[PDB]
Design a protein around this ligand. Structure first.
Ligand SMILES: [Zn+2]
Ligand SMILES: [Zn+2]
Length: 190
């Protein structure tokens, strides 16, 4: 009908990307759940989990794993329990979301290395970054193959370090991510 369209989304390398359906509620619900950390200027992450149905992914569960909260990272500390939870409930990893309580909306060095594993496993994988002090948010991915290659090769120690060239980009509007009016379940493993 009116205001509808078909999308064919491609990576930089020309690979077709399947659609990910994102609940309209997810961003705001996530900010609600992790507010105690945000008020302390501490980052929190959640994993975007779901299922593949008729050639498209549906995010159904926002899973908050055990993690180490700092002012500039929120790395998962117990991947075993996260994996066990996802396996038991047949939930795929589709991406992740995290806060920048006071920072601008961008992808940090750590964020790019974190995302690399997601997007190697699933070309469609996304990183949602909420920057509530700026009232902004963004959905990002690495360039594929070029950015994935840069991060795979990067051995710089040091929490925050620069990268040579363009490495990441915001998901286009419209593009392979579509919002839908769906229910949401938050699963907190903490
Ligand atoms: Zn970040
Ligand atoms: Zn690096």
């Amino acid at each position: 009908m009116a205001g509808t369209f078909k999308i064919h989304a491609y990576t930089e390398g020309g690979k077709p990307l399947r659609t990910i359906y994102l609940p309209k509620l997810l961003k705001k619900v996530f900010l609600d759940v992790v507010k105690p950390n945000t008020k302390k200027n501490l980052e929190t992450c959640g994993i975007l989990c779901g299922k593949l149905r008729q050639n498209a992914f549906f995010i159904t569960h926002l899973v908050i794993p055990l993690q180490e909260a700092t002012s500039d990272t929120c790395g998962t500390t117990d991947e075993a329990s996260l994996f066990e939870f996802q396996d038991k409930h047949n939930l795929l990893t589709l991406g992740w979301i995290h806060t920048h309580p006071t920072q601008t909306c961008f992808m940090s060095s750590v964020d790019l290395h974190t995302h690399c594993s997601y997007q190697l496993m699933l070309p469609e994988a996304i990183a949602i970054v909420m920057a509530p002090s700026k009232n902004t948010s963004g959905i990002f991915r690495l360039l594929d193959p070029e950015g994935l290659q840069t991060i795979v090769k990067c051995r710089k120690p040091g929490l925050f370090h620069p990268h040579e060239g363009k490495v990441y980009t915001m998901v286009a509007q419209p593009g392979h991510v579509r919002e839908i009016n769906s229910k949401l379940q938050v699963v907190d493993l903490r």
